[PDB]
Amino acid sequence: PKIQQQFSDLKRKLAEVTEEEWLSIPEVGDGELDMRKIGQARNTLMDMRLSQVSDSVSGQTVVD
Amino acid sequence: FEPLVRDINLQDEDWNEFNDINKIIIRQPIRTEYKIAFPYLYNNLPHHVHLTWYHTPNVVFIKTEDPDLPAFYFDPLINPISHREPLPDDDEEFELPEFVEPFLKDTPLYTDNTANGIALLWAPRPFNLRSGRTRRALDIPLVKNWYREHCPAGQPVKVRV
Amino acid sequence: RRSRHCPYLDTINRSVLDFDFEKLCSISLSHINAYACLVCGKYFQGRGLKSHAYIHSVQFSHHVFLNLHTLKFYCLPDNYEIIDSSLEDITYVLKPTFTKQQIANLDKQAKLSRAYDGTTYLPGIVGLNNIKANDYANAVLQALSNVPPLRNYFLEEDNYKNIKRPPGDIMFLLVQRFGELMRKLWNPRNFKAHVSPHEMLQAVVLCSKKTFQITKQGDGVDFLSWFLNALHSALGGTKKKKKTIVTDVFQGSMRIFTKKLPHPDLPAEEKEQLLHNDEYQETMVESTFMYLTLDLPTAPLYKDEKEQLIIPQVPLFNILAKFNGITEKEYKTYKENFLKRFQLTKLPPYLIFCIKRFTKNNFFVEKNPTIVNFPITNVDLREYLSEEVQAVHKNTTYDLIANIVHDGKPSEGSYRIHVLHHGTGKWYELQDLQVTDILPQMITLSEAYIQIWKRR
Amino acid sequence: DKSKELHAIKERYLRKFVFEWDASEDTSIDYNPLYKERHQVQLLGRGFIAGID
Amino acid sequence: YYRFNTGPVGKGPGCGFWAAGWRVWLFFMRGITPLLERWLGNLLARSHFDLELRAAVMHDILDMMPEGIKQNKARTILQHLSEAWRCWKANIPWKVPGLPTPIENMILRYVKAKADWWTNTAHYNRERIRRGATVDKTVCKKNLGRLTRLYLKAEQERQHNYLKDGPYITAEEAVAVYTTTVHWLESRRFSPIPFPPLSYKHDTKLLILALERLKEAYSVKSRLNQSQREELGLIEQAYDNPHEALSRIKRHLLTQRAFKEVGIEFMDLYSHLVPVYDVEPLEKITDAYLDQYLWYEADKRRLFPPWIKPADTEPPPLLVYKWCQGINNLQDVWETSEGECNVMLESRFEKMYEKIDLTLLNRLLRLIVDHNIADYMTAKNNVVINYKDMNHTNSYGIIRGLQFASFIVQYYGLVMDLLVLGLHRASEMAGPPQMPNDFLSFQDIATEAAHPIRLFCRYIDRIHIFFRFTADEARDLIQRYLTEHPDPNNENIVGYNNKKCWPRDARMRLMKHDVNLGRAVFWDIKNRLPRSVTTVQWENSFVSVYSKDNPNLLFNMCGFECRILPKCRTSYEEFTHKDGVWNLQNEVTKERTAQCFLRVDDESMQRFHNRVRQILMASGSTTFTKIVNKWNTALIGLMTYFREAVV
Amino acid sequence: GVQFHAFGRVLSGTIHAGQPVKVLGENYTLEDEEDSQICTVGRLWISVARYHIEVNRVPAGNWVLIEGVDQPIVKTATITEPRGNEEAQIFRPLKFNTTSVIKIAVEPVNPSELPKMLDGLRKVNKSYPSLTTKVEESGEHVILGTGELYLDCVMHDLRKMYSEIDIKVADPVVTFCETVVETSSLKCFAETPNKKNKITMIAEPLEKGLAEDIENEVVQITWNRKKLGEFFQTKYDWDLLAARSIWAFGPDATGPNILVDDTLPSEVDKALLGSVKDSIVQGFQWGTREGPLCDELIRNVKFKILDAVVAQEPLHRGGGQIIPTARRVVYSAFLMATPRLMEPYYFVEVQAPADCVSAVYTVLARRRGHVTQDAPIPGSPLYTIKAFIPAIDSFGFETDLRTHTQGQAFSLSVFHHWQIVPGDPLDKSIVIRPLEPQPAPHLAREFMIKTRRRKGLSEDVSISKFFDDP
């Protein structure tokens, strides 16, 4: 594909921008998916299970 | 010439069960001739290896040496034939008609051009044929057959190269 | 005479018996009159004196052999067939036969089937060994075997033994080898806990002209399409019987009310001329859509205020709405703008959708990481079906049965299958040889590639 | 020769406009005597090679 | 000539047979004729995808733009395109809500095309650099920058996917691993390292050592950056008021559970790019003090096990020499007459540093380190990696730049080794708690043959276990591997990794039993350690066996590719003590029972060649004396490390 | 190259397309019909050369190219009529002119395609009648063959017609055969497991000519007692009582080994020995087929059972215990007597011009072979030199003969007989080399060691390997 051909489809539709649209271009100087929810739930479950396992430790120290 | 397909080094394989040197019995080293002659039996992965024709029967043609001798004569080069049949007796009536004769009784068994004609049977291709098309002058290499044959014995290194 | 009192029968090694590979002799390398050894493990030929089996039994003292075709246990050195019903497990593992009713109680899978080894398991949830890069084919086979239609069809040898295939055809092996794999993968009392796809994969490699081999991995969608086409062309025999089991269980009808555009570089008059002269007309080219390639949208390649995770999610309904009548699609054909529009005329009982998550860029081949937010409990395609026969299809509540996800980089990638097992409700995720348990909410998290849904 | 034969057996087991082709690029250096000194084509005592006197 | 000039006609100029040369030159002329004819007829008549794509986009936009807007807004459109390009190269979204939708679509298409071209160019340049192509300093700098940006983007995507996919390690597997680690610690009776008391006896010494070790990095250069100057000032202030500095360090450790952004730069290694993470100066000082204290406490309490190889007691070449000497010290370590076979598996934990669960690290380190200190270290493990305009968070990988990485990596490696070696084997290798055994030593001769695992050295992200499997044990392992992974086509040997450095006579020889036993050992080692935490790939590892068919046992430890050849198989070969050879004698008999031939590993030679190439290429305007000094330093290092193997 | 079309002539009946047949295999005996495979022949053509012509039926006498009976037809088969002719036999297997002695191991370059290569190997085994294929204990895919061009054609068909994969072929070798020189060193007392039976056999080399007489089917054990006894007492000069106690014919029906029941009637009951006679004969045949030295066929031996102990009950005596004891006794007897490996010697008849017969003699000098007879062709200038070059060193001999003579001589080969190896096989004092040809006296030990290594067997075979005391 020619470089021109590449942007040819965009350049054809690009002419549809009106004069106001072609003049308001600012200067460059200025239900749903909760992906993290399942990860947080899994991390909380793992931490709870480990703490339950960690509750069986013998002499783990702690400095307040 | 340069290899058609890149060949890995000898160390690329490491003493495979079918490649162990400690198992192959060695009697004579298989030279490149013994591999190019039977490519399918003495060459692993012989991709695109054109086979060669087996030995055609030897052309035992006693070439003439003296025009004086007859055409179909037992030349001394030919090994002599050792002359050592329940033939029916002549008491029967196996009589042939008076008009029965060999087909070529008048035609001789030899001729002036007979021996020469029998010589042209075994000859280089332009001599072998008797009717051809006039090829181009450049398209007739007069020295190709010399190069195609094995190099003459005792030639210098330059000539062999 | 000597049967039912064989002392040598107490030495059979059930653990070493693996009847998955080819059925050939040890030394003879012949497939005729084979007789495997129930003690030596390997398989020999012959069933009497002066045959390889007798020599192998005398030399190695392994004095118990079973014929792979006669299915009888005989003492090869003594040539005295044994009779012991306690050995029926070996015959069942060698030749898994499903009863007329047992082939319909697959939904009543309550007790876990413990193998002869020390590993409890469930039929259907079994791993196929990844012989080199066989991951794609193994996943496709383990997913296609989940569908009760195909599993039931292949679990009865009578359904395909009498198929009138040409004598000089090799494609009939695919219909024959796949049946053996399906029967072995559903064995309730298999000696091992897994089945080797070596035979089926080798047959697929042979019957595909150096395509989709076991050495180099291939595309899962392409492999599934090729296997489905081969099964459809192999189920039919000596006729153009399109009503194959595969064609009836996983192929539907789509009515593509497609059209074309006149020209992008033409004025109003020239465009309207072609629009009215049937040069840009809309036509119905209804075909059989065995697989609906629901194309996922390319990643925006830009962050936003929302989406704390930078993986662009996408809802299944929006993804599958493209095939609806209203949604028009454009095809960049040569010297033409093929602006088409599809419509599902008829839905198959087990719709198979394969989202093309991998494309080719201008200098490479990238894989779109967009997630498909597909609920895996209930869904209806009646909102995207054709208006002509909307009420004709009484049932439309389809549920996903199996998902095959190709995780990893495009070049070096793993093919994992997340399948929703019947009998129970757990949607187990199966690796090449590892069977795990996947949470239903986590199934909709991994980027799926090929999905098969049951219309219920 | 003999050492060369053994080495060959082991091996089988495991810019500048050059006008005249140098002798390095030549072939027919065979260790075996049978393939080095071979009987010539004596045409039954009545023929010989072409070109030569 | 040689044909005609024979007999009475000798050498001379009278050869008039010219048909052959005439034919050759006629053919050459006939071939040449079309080209020359075309030239004569013509005489008488009458890689850069980025710039090209930018020019094409600019031309399209300008031609679409009206003359009323092309006077001055063309520069604005170019600036917008530049902002879009710089946005996609730093994971920063490009948001121009005041721009036309078709303009935004065109900009996005141009950005995608340029990103694809840049990715392809960077991959090609990295491949050429790895192969050894001829490049320059500008090209190397540009390729390194592009590769670093791509790696940062890939790491950000991987962290986002880890957050989306959740913890890779399952809860049951994590609980089992924690239980195993707790059991191991209880058996060792390791007293936890408490928080640094207010009156620690060696607190001043540890603080001074940490300050010295941090100062040694700041060599005398032409100048120092503002951050470098602040770091040097903080170091001087710490050396001025040790008590106040220790108090501040303790306060930061007990309170500062949310650190600043840690920089990330990639060392320009030709083969294996490595990161260079720079922590904040006060944070770096606190981390160094914590690391020195933790190392001292672990040494006092004997936390790290002996098989953890890198230590001050034995340098790496001496570690390899000791491993070679102790391999032959095992009873009947070479007697293959009874069918026994010994397999030494050399493997590495792929992505061990990258795939370190922060939550699991916090849950495990609390069992050894102080709970507050463990929480502080875990929090420090989570930071915002900042580099140029790209900033990403870290949640699933320990940062190697932090001074506490050594203790964290050592604990992770100890956990992994306990998982791999097993409870009984690790206990036997570490001896009784009262009288622990030395490195590569068993408490008794019977305890040496108590299991197939005999010698094992857990280097930093590099394992090496020597297993002397008996004939029955080897047969059982082969049977198990075939049962769990049959290969009826005998395709196990299709992938076995042999050493191409050593000649074909000394290599593994790839036998039938040998290859299968090696694959079985590799699988059994891989099947022990869960793949969720860390998995030793069967490709990048190496399992070598010695048996009746394999006479040489080859190993590759500490970058020194060795090959032990026992004298039982090396008979009829006198001992000529060359520099490369290392005669490994016995222990009691003191006789030479074998000969551990050594040679520099190809990785070390590749690294040396890459260093030499970089020094030559990055010489530039540096004086000849500087280049000579760099070459001398490289040669000194290479010769002093591989003292013998260099010959 | 996928399907196979069996070819034969109908001795009776009329084979027709679509008829159900019972294709009796090469071993479909009457007692054990297990080799039978009831098939449905169909679509058979006539025997045309370049363009076959179909036909509906095939009358008795014509040559029919059936299509479908190829599934059980390995080498040769006789198609019969199912449901009838229940008292039928299988046509005798082919007896070839010469014997195959060359062996060549073959393995695929990529072990992934091994099933394809083995399927192609089975197909090519079916294609070539005299071709022998097997897989040894070392896993090598050895395939036999008559000569050199034969195997070249086999490979050019295997790698390009049936199995299109690339296959790696090892260096060709010669199938060596065992042979005893001296008499039995001592009496070997071999006992069956559970010590219920204790057999004993004394080995002795067979009288010269008797081996070639048995191998030529002249001395047929199929004849009755009287004819065999007469042919043994008269031609072989054997004692009239010794010749009346033959038991079997060694490894095959026509085998170079003779089993003689030399048990003294004063100590061994004839009936009790007969109760183990079948087991003893089977064990002797298996041993002579296997061989104790290099796992090779044993020729030119006469193993005689000096004595034997036999228990009463068949549960304790015979069955699965006599056969292994018989094989062990046979191996011990053939090892105790001083053995010697044998190699095939192939008669070569080089037809060359009389001017080049000297070069033909010179070429055969460097291959350990003597020119048996030189003679000119009556009427033809070219002489016909006849020689006998051992097959082991005869690989490539044709290329050398036609190259040292500038392409003016052609030669053939056929395994005329077997000769003892120059050295000794059980010689542990001779070293070997990986790439240096062993000298003339160091051939037998080298041959034995290299055969036991290639076959993957144990590298040492002592005189007390299979003996009872060790």
Curated annotation (Swiss-Prot), chain B:
Tissue and organ distribution: Widely expressed.
Record's subcellular location: Nucleus; Nucleus speckle
Primary role: Plays a role in pre-mRNA splicing as core component of precatalytic, catalytic and postcatalytic spliceosomal complexes, both of the predominant U2-type spliceosome and the minor U12-type spliceosome. Functions as a scaffold that mediates the ordered assembly of spliceosomal proteins and snRNAs. Required for the assembly of the U4/U6-U5 tri-snRNP complex, a building block of the spliceosome. Functions as a scaffold that positions spliceosomal U2, U5 and U6 snRNAs at splice sites on pre-mRNA substrates, so that splicing can occur. Interacts with both the 5' and the 3' splice site.
Subunit structure: Part of the U5 snRNP complex. Component of the U4/U6-U5 tri-snRNP complex composed of the U4, U6 and U5 snRNAs and at least PRPF3, PRPF4, PRPF6, PRPF8, PRPF31, SNRNP200, TXNL4A, SNRNP40, DDX23, CD2BP2, PPIH, SNU13, EFTUD2, SART1 and USP39. Component of the U5.U4atac/U6atac snRNP complexes in U12-dependent spliceosomes. Within the minor spliceosome, which acts on U12-type introns, interacts with PPIL2 and RBM48. Core component of U2-type precatalytic, catalytic and postcatalytic spliceosomal complexes. Found in a mRNA splicing-dependent exon junction complex (EJC) with SRRM1.
Protein's UniProt name: Pre-mRNA-processing-splicing factor 8
Gene: PRPF8
Swiss-Prot record, chain C:
Zinc finger (UBP-type): 4-101
Keyword presence, Metal-binding: yes
EC number: 3.4.19.12
GO cellular component: nucleoplasm; nucleus; spliceosomal complex; U4/U6 x U5 tri-snRNP complex
Broad class of where this protein is predominantly found: nucleus
Source superkingdom: Eukaryota
GO MF, one annotated term: zinc ion binding
GO biological process: cell division; mRNA processing; mRNA splicing, via spliceosome; protein deubiquitination; RNA splicing; spliceosomal complex assembly
Effect of C207A: Complete loss of CHK2 and NFKBIA deubiquitination
Reaction catalyzed: Thiol-dependent hydrolysis of ester, thioester, amide, peptide and isopeptide bonds formed by the C-terminal Gly of ubiquitin (a 76-residue protein attached to proteins as an intracellular targeting signal)
UniProt entry tagged with the keyword Zinc: yes
Annotated localization: Nucleus
Summary of subunit composition and partner proteins: The U4/U6-U5 tri-snRNP complex is a building block of the precatalytic spliceosome (spliceosome B complex). Component of the U4/U6-U5 tri-snRNP complex composed of the U4, U6 and U5 snRNAs and at least PRPF3, PRPF4, PRPF6, PRPF8, PRPF31, SNRNP200, TXNL4A, SNRNP40, SNRPB, SNRPD1, SNRPD2, SNRPD3, SNRPE, SNRPF, SNRPG, DDX23, CD2BP2, PPIH, SNU13, EFTUD2, SART1 and USP39, plus LSM2, LSM3, LSM4, LSM5, LSM6, LSM7 and LSM8.
Record family assignment: Belongs to the peptidase C19 family.
Name the record gives this protein: Ubiquitin carboxyl-terminal hydrolase 39
Curated annotation (Swiss-Prot), chain D:
Post-translational modification: In vitro phosphorylated by CLK1 and U1 snRNP-associated protein kinase. Phosphorylated by SRPK2 and this phosphorylation is required for its association with the tri-snRNP (U4/U6-U5 tri-small nuclear ribonucleoproteins) and subsequent spliceosomal B complex formation. May be phosphorylated by SRPK2 on Ser residues in the SR domain; the phosphorylation is required for the removal of inappropriate R-loops during transcription.
Localization: Nucleus; Chromosome
Family note: Belongs to the DEAD box helicase family. DDX23/PRP28 subfamily.
Functional summary from the UniProt entry: Involved in pre-mRNA splicing and its phosphorylated form (by SRPK2) is required for spliceosomal B complex formation. Independently of its spliceosome formation function, required for the suppression of incorrect R-loops formed during transcription; R-loops are composed of a DNA:RNA hybrid and the associated non-template single-stranded DNA.
Subunit structure as annotated in this protein's UniProt entry: The phosphorylated form (by SRPK2) is a component of the U4/U6-U5 tri-snRNP complex composed of the U4, U6 and U5 snRNAs and at least PRPF3, PRPF4, PRPF6, PRPF8, PRPF31, SNRNP200, TXNL4A, WDR57, SNRNP40, DDX23, CD2BP2, PPIH, SNU13, EFTUD2, SART1 and USP39. Identified in the spliceosome C complex. Interacts with ERBB4. Interacts with ERCC6.
Name of this chain's protein: Probable ATP-dependent RNA helicase DDX23
Organism, scientific name: Homo sapiens
UniProtKB/Swiss-Prot annotation, chain F:
Primary subcellular site in the record, as a coarse category: nucleus
Residue stretches spanning the membrane: none
Location(s), subcellular: Nucleus
Annotated GO biological process: cellular response to xenobiotic stimulus; mRNA splicing, via spliceosome; response to cocaine
Signal sequence, start to end: none
Any one Gene Ontology molecular-function term assigned to this protein's record: GTPase activity
Gene Ontology cellular component terms for the protein in this record: Cajal body; catalytic step 2 spliceosome; cytosol; intracellular membrane-bounded organelle; membrane; nuclear speck; nucleoplasm; nucleus
Alphabetical UniProt keywords: Acetylation, Disease variant, GTP-binding, Intellectual disability, Isopeptide bond, mRNA processing, mRNA splicing, Nucleotide-binding, Nucleus, Phosphoprotein, Spliceosome, Ubl conjugation
Domain of life: Eukaryota
Quaternary structure annotation from Swiss-Prot or TrEMBL: Component of the U5 snRNP and the U4/U6-U5 tri-snRNP complex, a building block of the spliceosome. The U4/U6-U5 tri-snRNP complex is composed of the U4, U6 and U5 snRNAs and at least PRPF3, PRPF4, PRPF6, PRPF8, PRPF31, SNRNP200, TXNL4A, SNRNP40, DDX23, CD2BP2, PPIH, SNU13, EFTUD2, SART1 and USP39. Component of the pre-catalytic, catalytic and post-catalytic spliceosome complexes. Component of the minor spliceosome, which splices U12-type introns. Within this complex, interacts with CRIPT. Interacts with ERBB4 and PRPF8. Interacts with PIH1D1.
Record-stated family: Belongs to the TRAFAC class translation factor GTPase superfamily. Classic translation factor GTPase family. EF-G/EF-2 subfamily.
Name used for this protein in its record: 116 kDa U5 small nuclear ribonucleoprotein component
Source organism per UniProt: Homo sapiens (Human)
Gene this chain is encoded by: EFTUD2
Range covered out of full length: 487 to 956 of 972
